[PDB]
Design a protein around this ligand. Structure first.
Ligand SMILES: *[C@@H]1O[C@H](CO)[C@@H](O[C@@H]2O[C@H](CO)[C@@H](O)[C@H](O)[C@H]2NC(C)=O)[C@H](O)[C@H]1NC(C)=O
Ligand SMILES: *[C@@H]1O[C@H](CO)[C@@H](O[C@@H]2O[C@H](CO)[C@@H](O)[C@H](O)[C@H]2NC(C)=O)[C@H](O)[C@H]1NC(C)=O
Ligand SMILES: *[C@@H]1O[C@H](CO)[C@@H](O[C@@H]2O[C@H](CO)[C@@H](O)[C@H](O)[C@H]2NC(C)=O)[C@H](O)[C@H]1NC(C)=O
Ligand code: RUF
Ligand code: RUF
Ligand code: NAG
Ligand code: NAG
Ligand code: NAG
Ligand code: NAG
Ligand code: NAG
Ligand code: NAG
Ligand code: NAG
Ligand code: NAG
Lengths: 723, 729
């Protein structure tokens, strides 16, 4: 038997996880909720969820204070954007098992967070910030200026949530929780995207949703940064919020706050980025004693820039400070364009690189007094592998691979999670074999035990004909470009398979990796006998700037051409039926799919774009201007005009096209597909469409998810003459 | 050979390869009319024509001329340009006036840009126009205009123009101005939309528009706050440039001010007598008021003794609204279409003073419209001929002897002509006859004194010459007995039609209250292609709820939309198969508007009869559609009226049954009439029960999906869908 559409849709074959929250340097929680001792693996029950038997409300999430004296309960969850939401809250006392009733956290709270030490609490209600020193006492109102859709204290607006921070919160406690650092966003002049929301059938008149949303070249939100001392809050007088202004080099024009990182109890570092995102500045600000302000000396500014592109992968990387805070490490691209760990002195311009080579550091995971722990794709020169390394701080040549040889056949893609002081770590392996979860001791790196091996799943999959994955590379202009293929079971090299190109191809993307996945591709390969391939061409990430910056100021050119060239290279692989080649993608993949189908190349018979960008002036400023610069006569308007899918409408006469878009998509506005269809209508091209009423960019509803995949499978089977 | 080998193709339909010529004129006097080439005057009597306006005169103009309007006294011409469409009838435009006798454009005191409506008085050259929701009057074209109203406010106050609902469902027109017969008085309506909710939808516009626009229209959905209405009359002879003009209000009768009502008809009776018709929001009760000007007062009075009640116990009043009266010259009597004691619409003769009228026509047929009345004769269109409800002929009844009825069109050309409409001269001395089928449209001119034909205007013989070689479909018009009642249907049958083989069949559906899809009209449309090229029988059926056959049939779906008319379409299909020449594995259904609603209701009915269907811009649930139309048939969506059936008749609740059929759902995003919402809500329901289906939106298209490129695209898309559902290569 085979892995079927139903299997994928009704999630028949499950991937077991082992998610843990470190609580201390030797303990973690595991949802009843258990507490585990990392040393021995023994566990006691923390609370039965029959403790809230009579609670009366459906509990969404829990959150334990650092000191473990109180638990925060979250209910009435109402999802907003990708990260943002609203909820009700309650505080349960562990010391004396019962809830708090006096001075509760209001309904419709936008964000809550314990300080990093003890049980202090900061929350956001109606765009304003409040602080509770004790869970049962009244809160002090920090900000008074919050206003819906206009002023944002402690939480991000639409574009910051999605493109800058990947988070709704804009609150940063200092390490011991004395200081609360926050940002304030101002959206007064940011234009609003409006779209219909149809809601339940019983709603007679549709609702109009309005969201401040800066499209490429529009007026952006403005940002201010503040620090407040939470150990001197008066119930008599208003809390005083000290402002930290952006450096002079940023106040000269539009700019972003892109990073907040505390260094010590009294030292904070902020990163700022120009609107033309190729110049950024790191401020280190120290707290002044009697005077009570924050100073950011000019001689302590650290400039990060790029002549060939934008700075960072999506944003400048984050610093990891030493204990005294007089030094830090952060990832930057070296002189040959590869991203490696640089070591800075707070007082000095030059850093020394502590890693080198033709491969990249993915991130810094933990920093100790003796070692620095990082993840990279160095192992076997494979851009799509991921391994944990240890680097000796007094001798940089002493680098140990901690995950490389643990199970080299089944494990090539690792992420990690260290305990409070990096005493223990959990390795998470995501492929090529079934995911593997292991617990380790950093004092010597020996493995304590397996936490989850997925043997349950492995026994079930023994019964089904499963596809395989080929990960390899092709040479193009003397450079390696990586591809992967999901191959049908009992794959015959002397046979001719229909091929479907799964595309993303956005700047810094990586679609060829060692990760094990059960998705739509799995079914297409297992049941329909279709080869599903992906390709990382120019603009793709984790392989140096030369490749990544190749599309600087030129979205919709080389990365499009490379998908076409990829499909050509596969035709010449012998086992591909080149009368049956298709391409599909979501978001950026949708844009590339569309551009490829509009290319008039002749290679693809049909394709599917889901929620595609259609022209760049339609998408948000932060993401778009990062790669395209500004849509103005003196910058890059010409290429904004030359890279629309609309302009390629005539070429669509050559292919079969299915266009799909959610009508309540706040991210890629329905507008984008509305303009594509009008364009195809105007040149007389027949095509397939489908809208999803009240679905957003995810088309994530249980039923909408099934509908779309079902619809797409029918399109593909019809296009490929499959019954 | 020389055998017919061409067929009527999709491209033929989309590119207008075979075009119907039509002779459109506009009478300017009692014996003269205007016709376009260039613009000619034609003497109706002789045929002699001189050039009235050479095409070259307005090229110095600088602007592209969309339309023209000659003043009643032929001294001035109104030139319309910068036309920008709004709804089905309303638009904005610029206007310039060309003086004929001085032979040049009036430069001083021009009509402002963005004018909403312009209208000459019926005699002379007075002018009335609406700009920014206010009414202005020009006594002379080159002179300053006097402002009549001062209260006009966009989306709130409408003076002399209708709002969305009154435009689409009450008046079928943007204007709400009425000149008295000689231009002395100017009657107008004011609409107040203050508390009317707004429908909001996205307009995406040109691709250079970065942020979509949101369009906001005052639109009362069933049960919502309706617009209120006031009525006024202003004497245009006593206007002065020194004082603001005085407008005399005429208030509705007591029985209307008691609750929500509508102004449904305005008809001047003489120089000093106007008739009003009002309707209650529950549209079964209407009151005609006859109002007279009082000389010494300057005010209007509607005597309660002249008041006329018209009501219905089995449904609503009139076909879509009460009928309009036709007054005798002395405005002391009138003729008006109403239903007789047994549900048949016939001409009633009324005295202004008496309650009772006498019916001057009788029969198991109906009068369609009164077309003209003179001293001795009344002219009307009816479907009496041969007891064919879908036929239309011009008749003549003698006012002093009701048994003296002459058919004027019946026998003219019985074989090709069975569907007529007429256009009379200014005093009914001549008339143009228009025949729409079953043969090729034919256009003829007649004098009504002797009734002789004067000449053929257009005979479509160029078209006839082209069709001679094309394998054209034929139409079969007939009926079936159900519950002892005749129910008519029409079939567009493929060329060389063979009773002994099985054809696939498409049900073409409207089926709304008072609809008629079975008729004698000749059409070159999508169905002609499907029969001719693709060999599909496309059929239509008038079931319960359809019109022009009496109230017994028409009112059968009263307060029960989505029941019998839906059921009768299913039964129609079972009947069609039972005739033996239908492949019942291949039966489909499609419709637009109400037809889309019925299509959907049918496909969700679980009947097992239809394999697939197409719904275009359908109504999905009645609480989404407008008040005037929906309440006419459904009453109010309240617990103490008819909420139950409103809830019982949505397409959404039938989603589960769509698992059995193939469904194509189509909707323009800028549809102001049946909002995108209605399709949006169907699709969501189908997704929720796991039904796959085909969808297509049209960016910025409205209810008509009538852009050239958009029209071509949807018919092509629909054609692919049907061809695949039927296994046609
Ligand atoms: C957010 O920014 C807006 C727009 O820059 C500020 O609005 C201005 O406020 C000043 C002083 O109050 C006025 O003189 C201007 O006329 C305002 N401009 C506009 C267009 O509104 C606003 O002050 C800022 N709000 C906060 C809390 O920082
Ligand atoms: C703390 O600050 C807030 C805002 O500055 C004060 O609340 C405002 O009080 C002023 C008068 O001082 C009023 O004009 C506003 O209407 C108030 N705005 C509100 C309700 O947010 C608050 O009173 C301050 N506390 C004190 C007394 O210093
Ligand atoms: C249109 O109708 C609105 C509301 O139906 C009228 O508004 C009323 O006006 C008076 C004063 O002019 C207020 O005191 C009432 O309270 C208003 N009614 C309500 C309940 O809103 C308005 O007069 C009308 N507009 C015109 C000029 O005809
Ligand atoms: C496929 N894909 C992406 O395209 C992608 C993507 N991430 C991004 N960007 C970073 C997160 N915020 C949005 C941009 N993109 C591009 C994108 C996402 C959603 C809508 C439009 C765009 Cl252009 N991923 C993970 C991803 O998997
Ligand atoms: C097919 N068809 C109609 O459906 C029709 C229709 N006429 C109507 N109504 C009367 C005129 N004004 C609109 C309503 N309908 C029903 C309808 C039309 C347009 C949108 C929605 C509806 Cl429910 N015609 C002529 C007509 O030909
Ligand atoms: C595990 O065992 C140790 C000693 O046996 C004990 O101190 C600890 O509390 C236990 N941990 C849990 C969470 O059960
Ligand atoms: C939140 O809302 C509920 C229901 O409306 C109310 O009963 C409850 O007291 C609210 N919680 C608080 C603490 O405001
Ligand atoms: C944390 O650090 C602050 C600032 O240096 C210091 O004064 C204090 O000892 C700590 N806060 C508390 C009260 O725990
Ligand atoms: C940033 O980009 C702009 C626009 O391409 C360019 O003029 C400038 O040189 C860049 N700055 C740096 C530091 O390279
Ligand atoms: C039309 O023809 C008639 C008949 O000969 C002629 O008298 C007349 O002058 C023509 N039309 C006009 C009024 O110019
Ligand atoms: C209408 O607009 C045009 C173009 O802007 C202008 O030249 C003209 O004067 C306007 N006409 C009137 C009557 O105001
Ligand atoms: C006419 O009415 C308007 C608005 O009520 C007013 O402003 C204007 O002055 C009036 N004209 C005169 C002078 O009577
Ligand atoms: C039009 O009718 C009115 C009222 O009957 C009358 O007083 C007026 O003089 C008429 N106009 C002409 C000159 O025909």
């Amino acid at each position: 038997k085979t892995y079927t559409l139903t299997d994928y849709l009704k999630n028949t074959y499950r991937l077991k996880l082992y998610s843990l929250r470190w609580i201390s340097d030797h303990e973690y929680l595991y949802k009843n909720i258990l507490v585990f001792n990392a040393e021995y693996g023994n566990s006691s029950v923390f609370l039965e969820n029959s403790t809230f038997d009579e609670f009366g409300h459906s509990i969404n999430d829990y959150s334990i204070s650092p000191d473990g004296q109180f638990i925060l309960l979250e209910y009435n969850y109402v999802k907003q954007w990708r990260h943002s939401y609203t909820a009700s809250y309650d505080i349960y006392d562990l010391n004396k098992r019962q809830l708090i009733t006096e001075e509760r956290i209001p309904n419709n709270t936008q964000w809550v967070t314990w300080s990093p030490v003890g049980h202090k609490l900061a929350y956001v209600w109606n765009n304003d910030i409040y602080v509770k020193i004790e869970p049962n006492l009244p809160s002090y109102r920090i900000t008074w200026t919050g206003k819906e859709d206009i002023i944002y204290n402690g939480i991000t607006d639409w574009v910051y949530e999605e493109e800058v921070f990947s988070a709704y919160s804009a609150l940063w406690w200092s390490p011991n929780g004395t200081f609360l650092a926050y940002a304030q966003f101002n959206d007064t002049e940011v234009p609003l995207i409006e779209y219909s929301f149809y809601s339940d059938e019983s709603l007679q008149y549709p609702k109009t949703v309005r969201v401040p949303y800066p499209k490429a070249g529009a007026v952006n939100p403005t940002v201010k940064f503040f620090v407040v001392n939470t150990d001197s809050l008066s119930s008599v007088t208003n809390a005083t919020s000290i402002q930290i202004t952006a450096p002079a080099s940023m106040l000269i024009g539009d700019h972003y706050l892109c990073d907040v990182t505390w260094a010590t109890q009294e030292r904070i570092s902020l990163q700022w980025l120009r609107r033309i995102q190729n110049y950024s500045v790191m401020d280190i600000c120290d707290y002044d004693e009697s005077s009570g302000r924050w100073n950011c000396l000019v001689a302590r500014q650290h400039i990060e820039m790029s002549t060939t592109g934008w700075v960072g992968r999506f944003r400048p990387s984050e610093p990891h400070f030493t204990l005294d805070g007089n030094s830090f490490y952060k990832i930057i691209s070296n002189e040959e364009g590869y991203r490696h760990i640089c070591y800075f002195q707070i007082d000095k311009k030059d850093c020394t690189f502590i890693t080198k080579g033709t491969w990249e550091v993915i991130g810094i995971e933990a920093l100790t007094s003796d070692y620095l722990y990082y993840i990279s794709n160095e192992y076997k020169g494979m851009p799509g592998g991921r391994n944990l390394y240890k680097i000796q701080l007094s001798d940089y040549t002493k680098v140990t691979c901690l995950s490389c040889e643990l199970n080299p056949e089944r494990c090539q893609y690792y992420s990690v999670s260290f305990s409070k002081e990096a005493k223990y770590y959990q390795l998470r392996c995501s492929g090529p074999g079934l995911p593997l979860y292991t617990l380790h001791s950093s004092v010597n790196d020996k493995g304590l035990r397996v936490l989850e091996d997925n043997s349950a799943l492995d026994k079930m999959l023994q019964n089904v004909q499963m596809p395989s994955k080929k990960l390899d590379f092709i040479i193009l202009n003397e450079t390696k470009f990586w591809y992967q293929m999901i191959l049908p079971p009992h794959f015959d090299k002397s046979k001719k398979y229909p091929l479907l190109l799964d595309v993303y191809a956005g700047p810094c993307s990586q679609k060829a990796d060692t990760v094990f996945r059960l998705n739509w591709a799995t079914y297409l390969a297992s049941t329909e006998n279709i080869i599903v391939a992906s390709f990382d061409g120019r603009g793709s990430g984790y392989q140096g700037d030369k490749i990544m910056h190749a599309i600087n100021r030129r979205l919709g050119t080389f990365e499009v051409e490379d998908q076409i060239e990829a499909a050509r290279q596969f035709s010449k692989m012998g086992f591909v039926d080149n009368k049956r080649i298709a391409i599909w993608g979501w978001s950026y993949g949708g844009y590339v799919t569309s551009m490829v189908l509009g290319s008039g190349s002749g290679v693809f018979k049909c394709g599917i774009a889901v929620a595609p960008v259609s022209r760049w002036e339609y998408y948000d400023s932060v993401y778009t201007e990062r790669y395209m610069g500004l849509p103005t006569p003196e910058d890059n308007l010409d290429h904004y005009r030359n890279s629309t899918v609309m302009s390629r409408a005539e070429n669509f006469k050559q292919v079969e096209y299915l266009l799909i878009h959610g009508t309540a998509d706040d991210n890629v506005h329905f507008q984008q597909s509305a303009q594509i269809s009008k364009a195809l209508v105007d040149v007389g091209v027949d095509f397939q469409a489908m809208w999803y009423t009240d679905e957003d960019h995810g088309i994530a509803s249980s039923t909408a998810h099934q509908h779309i995949y079902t619809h797409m499978s029918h399109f593909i089977k019809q296009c490929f003459s499959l019954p």
